[PDB]
Design a protein around this ligand. Structure first.
Ligand SMILES: Nc1ncnc2c1ncn2[C@@H]1O[C@H](CN2CC#Cc3nc4c(N)ncnc4n3[C@@H]3O[C@H](CNC(=O)CCNC(=O)C2)[C@@H](O)[C@H]3O)[C@@H](O)[C@H]1O
Ligand SMILES: Nc1ncnc2c1ncn2[C@@H]1O[C@H](CN2CC#Cc3nc4c(N)ncnc4n3[C@@H]3O[C@H](CNC(=O)CCNC(=O)C2)[C@@H](O)[C@H]3O)[C@@H](O)[C@H]1O
Ligand SMILES: Nc1ncnc2c1ncn2[C@@H]1O[C@H](CN2CC#Cc3nc4c(N)ncnc4n3[C@@H]3O[C@H](CNC(=O)CCNC(=O)C2)[C@@H](O)[C@H]3O)[C@@H](O)[C@H]1O
Ligand SMILES: Nc1ncnc2c1ncn2[C@@H]1O[C@H](CN2CC#Cc3nc4c(N)ncnc4n3[C@@H]3O[C@H](CNC(=O)CCNC(=O)C2)[C@@H](O)[C@H]3O)[C@@H](O)[C@H]1O
Lengths: 261, 261, 261, 261
């Protein structure tokens, strides 16, 4: 069917992409990067994240596949050597689709902007000290003082979330996880410290205390927002769909990426 | 209906219990500690955990209520001053029941023993070094060397799990969370480090490497098991039911217990 | 003798400063903010840090005293109510001087800039990913990938260092402590993780791998450096001297600031 | 001169020991395990710790050397292949001696017992909850509730201390480091959390609150003490001396053991 292929842009990924396109030419497959049904990412996790964001408005009509030519490649399912095997199996179809949860960030001013995240959404201050009130389903939970905050999807829990001390959570769990970056904790200022895991339909809201300017980074795209009144996090109703042709369990993916391989 | 009341056993809790029983005497309420439908725990969280284990074979016929005369009282919903208000509201009934997930531990030898946990199930060695292989849905994930391991329910995530660095997770999430106690990490020995959160139907199995004797502690009842072949953790099919007469959200319960009150 | 007084600049601190100056007028004390021998800081720790940096080129001729009108005031020894008692005791003199170690940062380009720190010196990237090689006394120790790094004095170990997981160390120890901010740790990238404590005469050098632009923050004064070839940390030969009129041990200062007061 | 050799007791270490003894037979070296001047440990760190404790009453007349046939071997300086090179260089003498600090633990009852540690001294309860008051130079610092506490030497900071989150500190620093094992931190119970680093002559005292029975483990020799009134930690006046024949810096030792080799 309709497919497209994105490349990291080095020689290896570009040539692999040309060879897969040439192989797709022997099947009833049309190359279409406007309305693809299959999106192939050849590169690292950064390349995969770019592919997700390139098509985030057609998520329910698209199944993604990652081929890793990069370094780690956590979202990848294939090594370059199996590209010919992938072309053939994809050609037929009849694959299984697996869905992972996504995170919605809403930013309100004084106007709303919404963003979708596959890994995480973080917030830091523009220059001065970061201070926000943390409100959970409209109840004031804590005042946070420190470097910033990170809200992660389940599949994002192995990325920045992990380096901040968060728990790794299986992507079948519809949740988001809030982790702290370096908070002040003394006699006057206290935070919960621990990561927090929220289910679907819980809303986490960050309200400015003094400074209203923040740097909000969604999957490593960092944007300065001015005159912010509220940042709201919630599990998205939208999901990313993966094309799976063979069992590669999450916990094996975790083992291969962090323990040994 | 049928109810019973357990007490921490100090003067304050004993007298409160006698006064609630006297007040229940003015309603169609029978005291029955064999087949109660309502179990009232007057004391701390330890007293509440004892009450849960006293009736863990009638969990689907029982709704629990905690009154805190202890110190922290995380599972408590009432202060002693409101005991008369509780008696009256309980008398009628028509309350809302809320359900929290539970954790099942199976211990196999060479014979099976199963245990149910409301807070957590932990494992340490009997004397020598603790070394187990960690197997997730039959796939070898890691070899753990260190002090021991802790598997927590969601409502347990605020207890020992929290002190071990685990994430606090809302009890509407059917999951269990595995945290490490002091693992060796050097050039030869490596663990994942991060807490792990498992959904329902995932099975975590600990397999001995050399020593087969372990100290297994379920909600702080520590038992020595000998000749252990396997310890298996999974989210229980059984749930604890709470009688709720007013909104007391989990995250407010967390705020009151850890931030301020 | 010669003294000066700096103020946080709110009404409370300004009026306190005017009243201390009026009281100093009844003694053989000259106000001199060019060559003071005593520097009084009225305000928080930020005000005290500003005072230290205002006179960092006359450190061996100056004894500092902090009066806290701010919030925490970790470097403060006096409450505003005791200001009259301080004026009198300072008037005579015959006080004890206590010395704390300081941290030297050298930044080299392609030209050297040196900075002195009382709390800490940290380094982050200008925008892209932070990657440096960490070299200890000319031996390559690790490649660090993450948010950045923090090098703390002993008296700084209770500040940012503490929030990054570092150890609190008594200021009689001539050392510096290196802590990580959110490092990547997976199969390909590894750091030591743990804080590192270096004695006098050990030199820690950060060498860029790709990007050469860094944001270097010395006691919260953040400066962008371009075309950086090396950042070198070492315990300074210079020390800050405090005027002490009564025993206020470090560990009591720590207790009062973090446990209870 | 006078020397002895201890072995891990496997074939490899036993045969290596016999071959070194045979080689020492061609020099003016006498085997004497009562009053040796050189103690050679062939095995892992556990074997080295046993050797240290076998001769802890002649520490100022003994220089130690470790040969690693074990797994990690942090205190080892030689691989088995260099044993012949070591015999020859030791034969002459004229080596450099390096000294590392040690930790003294005093246990008082109601009678004093003292112990010396090369890695660390830890304390846990005998069965019930561990609660002690922590007193620093006679000032009450905190009440600790949790699993236990660990006091580490500098060279011990890479062992259990590291797994508990402590800082790694260069052994030229005469200090000890106190780390927590899983403490309760909520609205009612609070600890400092952070590791604490103490200089020489500071005394840390643990005073029981209720239960007086503790399990005290010195370099992994765990002893039950009953009716304990006080546990006092301080940097020992005694030092362990190493024979060094070539530069092997601590931070390179750390790199080789934890980063790569
Ligand atoms: N994510 C972070 N977490 C923790 N600390 C952080 C941080 N980012 C920066 N810092 C520190 O801020 C200092 C500069 N700050 C004034 C100084 C303070 C100071 N020094 C010590 C000390 N030696 N021991 C014990 N408490 C100390 N504190 C106290 O710490 C708080 C610091 N305030 C902030 O975090 C807001 C941003 N900072 C400023 O506007 C000016 C106050 O309560 C203060 O009384 C930096 O130097 C860095 O350390
Ligand atoms: N949960 C825990 N996590 C981490 N360490 C723990 C621990 N519980 C105890 N320990 C340490 O064990 C030492 C006693 N151990 C021999 C010694 C070792 C040693 N010393 C140093 C040092 N100075 N620097 C760097 N690596 C060092 N290591 C290495 O650490 C591992 C220790 N092995 C174990 O954990 C198993 C139980 N232990 C024993 O049977 C005998 C080995 O790789 C070893 O080469 C205690 O003293 C305590 O520290
Ligand atoms: N201090 C920090 N520590 C840890 N991670 C941090 C971080 N600051 C940012 N990030 C993450 O970077 C992602 C964006 N990054 C590409 C993506 C990656 C990705 N996703 C997952 C996942 N789901 N599970 C497991 N490993 C995953 N990784 C791997 O993580 C590394 C990320 N590389 C960097 O840190 C450098 C800066 N980043 C970029 O240029 C683009 C690589 O090995 C990658 O294969 C952000 O989204 C944030 O998470
Ligand atoms: N090193 C450690 N650190 C932290 N917790 C530890 C621990 N070792 C064991 N535990 C927990 O003790 C529970 C059993 N304990 C009663 C229960 C309590 C409970 N449950 C929850 C919950 N769900 N959320 C939030 N706070 C909760 N707490 C509170 O936690 C404290 C627990 N007290 C102790 O630590 C002393 C030893 N314990 C007992 O005699 C009986 C109290 O304030 C209590 O109100 C175990 O189950 C384990 O979790």
């Amino acid at each position: 069917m309709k497919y497209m292929i994105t490349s990291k842009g080095d020689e290896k990924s570009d040539l692999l992409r040309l060879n897969m396109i040439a192989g797709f030419g022997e099947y009833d497959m049309e190359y279409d990067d406007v309305e693809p049904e299959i999106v192939i990412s050849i590169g690292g996790d950064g390349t995969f994240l770019s592919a997700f964001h390139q098509y985030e408005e057609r998520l329910d009509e698209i199944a993604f596949i990652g081929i890793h030519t990069g370094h780690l490649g956590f979202y990848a399912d294939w090594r370059p050597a199996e590209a010919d095997k992938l072309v053939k199996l994809l050609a037929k179809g009849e694959y299984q689709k697996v869905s992972y949860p996504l995170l919605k960030t809403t930013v309100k001013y004084g106007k709303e902007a919404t963003y979708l995240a596959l890994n995480e959404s973080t917030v830091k201050s523009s220059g001065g000290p970061f201070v926000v009130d943390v409100v959970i389903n409209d109840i004031h939970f804590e005042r946070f003082r420190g470097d910033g905050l990170c809200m992660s999807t389940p599949s994002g829990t192995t990325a920045y979330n992990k380096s901040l001390g968060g728990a790794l959570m299986h992507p079948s769990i519809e949740a988001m996880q809030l982790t702290e970056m370096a908070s002040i904790n003394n006699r006057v200022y206290r935070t919960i410290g621990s990561p927090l895991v929220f289910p679907k339909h819980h809303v986490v809201s960050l309200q400015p205390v003094n400074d209203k300017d923040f740097q909000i980074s969604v999957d490593h795209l960092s944007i300065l927002h001015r005159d912010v009144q509220e940042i709201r996090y919630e599990v998205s109703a939208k999901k990313i769909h993966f094309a799976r042709f063979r069992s590669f369990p999450f916990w094996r993916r975790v083992h291969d990426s962090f323990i040994e391989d």
